[PDB]
Amino acid sequence: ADTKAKLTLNGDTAVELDVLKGTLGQDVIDIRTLGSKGVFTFDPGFTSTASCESKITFIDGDEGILLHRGFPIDQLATDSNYLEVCYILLNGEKPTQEQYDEFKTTVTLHTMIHEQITRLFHAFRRDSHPMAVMCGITGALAAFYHDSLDVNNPRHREIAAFRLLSKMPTMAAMCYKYSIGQPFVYPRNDLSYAGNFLNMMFSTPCEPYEVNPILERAMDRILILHADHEQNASTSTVRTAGSSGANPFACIAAGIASLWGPAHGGANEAALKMLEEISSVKHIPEFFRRAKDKNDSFRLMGFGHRVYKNYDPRATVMRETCHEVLKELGTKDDLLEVAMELENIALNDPYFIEKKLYPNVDFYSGIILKAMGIPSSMFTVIFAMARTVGWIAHWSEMHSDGMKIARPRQLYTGYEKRDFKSDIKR
């Protein structure tokens, strides 16, 4: 311990504050009774403020460390599967065969969505973005599932969580099928979480679909690697919304919208344009998309990350998996080889070395999905569908903490009181 005893805040006289010690990472200064004395801190963005105590995910950016209930992301990604990882994130411990089998069975038994929610899909335009459709469908669930909205009832919370974990993939695949004009595919209980997804994504009544083991395993890993990422913007949106008592589905829709957010920029969509609509080592990785990099233009595309200093721990296995996929699909991948030239640039180009634009999990996640024949508009849908369990865990944990209602202060610098006098008459 350093100065993990206490501390003093002095304005004109002292104020002794406690310091809480964490099991990992930095310890914090307890300031809960401060404002209750008038004294407030100023911190837009909360980068110097701990908003909660959590035991879910630990991250050490400078060390490139990511843990889920104490387990390193690499261990879980390689020796587990999305559902077992979900069980761990939600319960805190790994399941025994009895626990896993129970959980797994409940998840599969609720994959089918109500027949009327499917009617809602047909009211959206065919030209709409799959992500927006997904947010719309998600923010519409509480109208049907009115029987599991109480965040203060464990029964409601557990049913809600299962409804999200079971149904999100089905929704996601449907946002896909509708966008391309193909018929919706029902979930099949005999197929794994990832296999059933790939099926609902690519199945067609014209012939039975064959789920490739390497693709199924690749998908499930994309899910694991996107299951959670600690107190980020999207997760904080789930916690802040739910702190007022907002239903689960409404909190998930907001998490999706937040994870969607950074892609709305005009310069973002314009660069992703060239990344997509362009295919050749002389085309993109040759002073075209490389020279056309102006304001942000990187993390969204798989380069760099504010959380990690030198590398994204999620990229290790994702890069290993990218090899296996590119190798397996071959006759359905070799053309996408430019991934090597994009990676070559991110590691050697001075612009990328200096700005620490290392390929993150999404660089390799993107290459895999593209190779599988999935469009870019569906990538974040799949990441969000994966992150939902993390949202549930953080949301469930926020409630056990007594559902602290987000009621922040403000620094008011507007007009002092003044009288209202308007001579208009419209």
Binds ligand NAD by CB under 6 A, chosen from 33, 91, 189, 310: 189
Residues facing residue 16 across a β-bridge: 8
Annotation marks residue 305 as catalytic: yes
In the region spanning residues 150 to 179, those forming contacts with ligand NAD, defined by CB under 6 A, are: 158-159, 162-163
Binds a copy of itself by CB under 8 A, chosen from 163, 172, 222, 258: 258
Q: Whole-angstrom Cα distance, residue 303 to residue 144? A: 40
**Could you tell me where the DSSP H helices lie in 203-337?**
213-224, 233-242, 248-260, 266-276, 314-329
Closest CB 147 distance from ligand NAD, rounded Å? 6
Per DSSP, the residues of 296-322 read S-SGGGTB--SS-SS--THHHHHHHHH
Breaks in the chain listed by the residue before each, with C–N > 2.5 Å: none
Residue 5 is a binding residue for ligand NAD (CB under 6 A): no
Residue 111 is a binding residue for ligand NAD (CB under 6 A): yes
Residue 158 is a binding residue for a copy of itself (CB under 8 A): no
In the region spanning residues 173 to 202, those forming contacts with a copy of itself, defined by CB under 8 A, are: 177-178, 181-183, 186-190
Residue 211 binds what, of ligand NAD, a copy of itself, none (CB under 5 to 8 Å, by partner type)? none
Check 220, 305, 333, 394 and give the catalytic one. 305
Q: Whole-angstrom Cα distance, residue 345 to residue 352? A: 7
Residue 180 is a binding residue for ligand NAD (CB under 6 A): yes
Stretch that binds a copy of itself, among 147-155, 210-218, 308-316, 331-339 (CB under 8 A): 147-155
Check 68, 312, 362, 394 and give the catalytic one. 362
Residue 400 is a binding residue for a copy of itself (CB under 8 A): no
Binds ligand NAD by CB under 6 A, chosen from 11, 38, 181, 213: 181
Tell me, by CB under 8 A, how many residues bind a copy of itself.
168
Round to the nearest angstrom and report the end-to-end CA distance of the chain.
Answer: 67
Which amino acid appears at position 67 of this protein?
Answer: L
What track of x and - describes contact with a copy of itself for positions 94 through 123 (by CB under 8 A)? xxxx--xx--x------xx-xxxx-xx-xx
For 139, half-sphere exposure in the C-beta direction (CA atoms, 13 angstrom radius) is 13
Which residue, among 317, 328, 319, 320, has the nearest Cα to 371 in the 3D structure? 328
Q: Whole-angstrom Cα distance, residue 327 to residue 227? A: 26
Q: Give 118-127's long-range contacts (Cβ < 8 A, gap of 24+).
A: 118/174, 118/184, 121/174, 121/175, 121/178, 121/184, 122/178, 124/178, 126/178, 126/179, 126/181
Annotation marks residue 362 as catalytic: yes
Closest CB 326 distance from a copy of itself, rounded Å? 27
Closest CB 398 distance from a copy of itself, rounded Å? 9
Residues within the interface to ligand NAD (CB under 6 A): 106, 108-114, 147-148, 158-159, 162-163, 180-182, 187, 189, 204, 206
